[PDB]
Amino acid sequence: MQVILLDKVANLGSLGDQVNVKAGYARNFLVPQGKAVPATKKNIEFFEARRAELEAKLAEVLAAANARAEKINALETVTIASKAGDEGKLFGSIGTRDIADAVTAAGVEVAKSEVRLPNGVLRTTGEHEVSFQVHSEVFAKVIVNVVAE
Amino acid sequence: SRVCQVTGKRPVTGNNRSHALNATKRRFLPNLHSHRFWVESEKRFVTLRVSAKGMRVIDKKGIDTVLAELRARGEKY
RNA sequence: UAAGGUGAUAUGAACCGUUAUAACCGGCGAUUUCCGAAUGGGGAAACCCAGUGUGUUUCGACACACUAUCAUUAACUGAAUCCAUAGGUUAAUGAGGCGAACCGGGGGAACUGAAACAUCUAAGUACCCCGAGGAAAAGAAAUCAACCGAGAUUCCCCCAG
RNA sequence: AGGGUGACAGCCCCGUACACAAAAAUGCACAUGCUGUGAGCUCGAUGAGUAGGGCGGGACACGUGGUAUCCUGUCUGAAUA
RNA sequence: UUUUGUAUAAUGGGUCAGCGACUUAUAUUCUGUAGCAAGGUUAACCGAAUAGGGGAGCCGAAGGGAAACCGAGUCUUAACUGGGCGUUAAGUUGCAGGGUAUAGACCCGAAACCCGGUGAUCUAGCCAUGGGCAGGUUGAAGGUUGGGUAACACUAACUGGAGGACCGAACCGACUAAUGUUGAAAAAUUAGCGGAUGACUUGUGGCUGGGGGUGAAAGGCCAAUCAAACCGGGAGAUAGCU
RNA sequence: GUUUAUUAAAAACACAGCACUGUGCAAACACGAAAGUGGACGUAUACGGUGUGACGCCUGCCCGGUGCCGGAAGGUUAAU
RNA sequence: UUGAGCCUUGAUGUGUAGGAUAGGUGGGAGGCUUUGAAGUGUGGACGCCAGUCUGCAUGGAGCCGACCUUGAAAUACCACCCUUUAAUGUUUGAUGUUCUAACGUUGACCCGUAAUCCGGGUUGCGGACAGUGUCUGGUGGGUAGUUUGACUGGGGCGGUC
RNA sequence: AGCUUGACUGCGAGCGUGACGGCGCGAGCAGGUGCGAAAGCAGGUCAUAGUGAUCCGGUGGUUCUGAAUGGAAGGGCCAUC
């Protein structure tokens, strides 16, 4: 018997594939409990059809959107002038909150949840880098010069 | 009577032959079993007296097509 | 068609008719008790007992019609259970039983013969059962043939004991 | 032809040969009206638990035999111009 | 008639009259006869239809060999002085007849086997529902009251009415004898005989069916039939026998 | 008590009683192609089969043969 | 829990000439080393206990091909492999426990239904068993069909053919 | 006692004997052989018993057949169980 699964089924299941099974197991258990359907031509073509297509669409859309995000702002530079004092050590330290909306005003619209901070609360006046996680593998690195006003 | 409801298998007749070829009448009987078939399109169990190759042909043709044949030839299920 | 008739044993009585509505012959109608598939329920066949509806200017009793089962179809209802199926009620259509042989199919002997008997024969005969028709069945090559060809089925004469 | 008539009838009677006859109901055959039904053309398809097999039995003139072929009770099982 | 042999006291027949047994079909062989003759003849069928067509076929003119094959020869065998079978003589189609074969096969006759039905109004068992058993004896258990015991046990009188109990009619049966035995009767009569409240008997209805029933068992009974009912059919079974 | 209706009424059959054996209930067993039914609306103190046949005293030895019951090691052993 | 097959891969295999617990074949003379060396402490795998292999490390950076006694060359490199074994993955069978989902239910309850049939529903129990079909061995006078010679101073018994 | 395989193969005039099936005797012809110098003798044993039809089938040989054709299977024929 050549049933097509519809479930996780214990020792043979992978949610819609082809298995060779005994007949008693098929008509007495699998078929009435949901769980399976026999491979009788048209259905196996049709069931496959949408499922195979599904895999192609989701992956491609995700990759493309993320590559596009990585590409965004062409200047790749966000500058900020925050209140400070004499020779370094600024008054109020910026965070990931401040920059998340600052980049919105000058390019990329990335939120607080996707910016990686190796510098922490960034308490230094100099050249800094905020590497974005536009995707799990794609990194969008925008250079930042912090000005001590 | 011992008729398969799918394939229509009556008991037929024959001979016990022996080593001395003595002909005796016998009956060959079908392998009739009373099995309860789930139909998904109706969401019910229709119980039939099938042969054990009426179950083969139900496994191949599907139960719906078979029930359409029984309803077609007036076999009541 | 008609000058004679009212069937026979079977005569009588009482009448009908003779130029056309006597009688006789034919076509189509009408009536067609009761039993019988018998069909409203029952039953020891030719009998017993009903229900429902319609009508009956003495409607305290009558008359008429319908009411079997099954199959198919439709409508209205309808459980365990919600939907639904089973079931129930009504209506429409059809069937049912008989018949001599022929026909197809499902079953299927034995005596007998073998100079015994068991394989074999008798014999797929007798018989039983189902079904159909005026015929049935079969039938339009997944058939033969044989390197040539034939062209569905059925029946008859050979082939050929 | 035949039958009857008081014995054996061509010409006595009924008939026979032959020639005609239907108000009505019908069977068959043409013609025709309506309804249903579908012609013809191009292209495509061209019958699966089936053929075949194992076991048991039956039908084929053919008794399992070296036994083709057909049918199938049981277990299986293709290729598909 | 059957026999070695029948007046035979072996079979058959009372007599008469009527009926009563070698047939029919289809094949094959031989004889007679008729036609044609190295040829004879058609079958189905068409049909002006016993004509005429129809020569499909069959038989004959060529055999030998298992067969290929050869052919007035052939087979055997490595081959035959040889040997086997042929050569050297007319057949064929009707009609009539004698045999033969297949059919009931000259006629009559079994016991029996099988198939389908009808029978439990008789009888056998069982089921249901109603009846029957005059009259007379015997006197169990129990009980009551006395006696008796520690209480029982036990014991006596009275009561009581058990029992496939006793005697005996109806009722059921059938042990003996005689009669009867072409009966009064296809199983009885007469005189005695057994049971007779029970495992009894009986009425009405029902149920069981043929290799089946039922059987307190005899192979008994199942409609005067029973080591396998009756009816109808296979069926004219078969009969080396009369 | 019963039996050969119609030549046998008996010592034969039956019997209470005894024993052996099967049977755990959808019982064994029987009729039935099957469904079902009887066993029994019973349940092992019950039911079926077989023998013996009130009661009394008793019922001895033999398991090699045939059967039955039990065993599973080995030999042989079908379809496949 | 138990066998085989296969893949990768690592081992495995002393007439005797002889430094060699070397099977064949075969292209080839550099492999080899600091992606941290020979030799050794030591345990284990292996054992015809002859002598391989080898985790870590003191040590510390070299070891060796044609050469040579051989039927053969040096698993120093490699390829294809026979025997024998080691680990993994994988491919299937076997057995036992456990499970619920087929089937059985002559358990209980509900419904068709004013019904100890039947069917359907809920649930309990049993459950791949039982049961039935085809095939097959055994048993099988429970039943059926039959056979059971002739001669013979009647037949049987004896004898004979 | 020496040497040997005639305990040959194909045939067979003619006879005997049986109802038949069958059985028996056989000079001679051909091929090849043994013994003998040779004439010759040898197709089992001094003779008469020592046996079993047909069917079915087994083994060896032989294209004789071989259901389209080439083979083969099966059959035939010869030997034989």
3-state SS, one letter per residue, for A87-112: CCCCCCCCCHHHHHHHCCCCCCCCCH
Q: How close does chain B come to A39, measured CA to CA in Å? A: 10
From residue B6, give the alpha-carbon distance in Å to each of A13, B13, B45, B57: 32, 21, 16, 8
Interface contact B38-A40, CB threshold 8 A: no
In the DSSP assignment, the letter for residue A42 is H
Q: Amino acid identity of A80?
A: I
Q: Where are the domains of chain B?
A: 1-77
- Chain A residues lying within 8 Å of B38, measured CB to CB: 27, 31-32
Token pair of A93 as six digits = 């330290």
Residue B60 contacts strand D, CB under 7 A = yes
Is B7 buried (19+), middle (13-18) or exposed (0-12) by CB count in 10 A? middle
Strand G proximity list, CB < 7 Å: A 24-25, 28-29, 33; B 27-36, 45, 47
Contact between A1 and A38 (Cβ < 8 Å): yes
Taking the C-alpha atoms of residue B12 and residue A111, their distance in angstroms, rounded to an integer, is 83
Contact residues on chain B for A22, CB-CB shorter than 8 A: none
Interface with A, mutate which of B38, B48, B50 (most A CBs under 10 A): B38
Residue position matching structure tokens 């196996």: A44
In three-state secondary structure terms, A41 is coil
Q: Is A113 on the interface with B (CB under 8 A)?
A: no
Residues with Cβ within 8 Å of residue B15, at least 6 apart in sequence: B23, B24, B25, B26
What was the structure determination method? Answer: cryo-EM
Please work out, in degrees rounded to the nearest 5, the angle formed at the alpha carbon of residue B37 by the alpha carbons of B32 and B43.
Answer: 160
Strand A127-132, strand A115-116: pairing: antiparallel
Task: Give the burial class of B28: count Cβ atoms within 10 A of its Cβ; 0-12 exposed, 13-18 middle, 19 or more buried.
Answer: exposed
Does the CB of A44 have a partner CB in chain B at under 8 Å?
Answer: no
- Whether the CA torsion A107, A109, A115, A119 is positive or negative: it is positive
Determine whether the interchain pair B37/A27 forms a contact, defined as Cβ–Cβ distance below 8 Å. Answer: yes
Q: CB-based burial of residue A125 (10 Å sphere; 0-12 exposed, 13-18 middle, 19+ buried)?
A: middle
- CA angle (A109, A115, A118) in 5-degree steps: 150
* Among candidate residues B26, B27, B29, B25, the one with its CA nearest the CA of residue B9: B29
Distance from CA of A28 to the nearest CA of B (A): 8
DSSP assignment, residue A135? Answer: S
| Cα B35 from Cα B55, distance rounded (Å) | 9
Note the resolution in Å, 1 decimal: 3.4
| Type of residue at A100 | A
A23 contacts chain B (CB < 8 A): yes
What is the spatial distance between Cα B60 and Cα A1, in angstroms, rounded to a whole number?
Answer: 9
d(CA A55, CA A5): 18
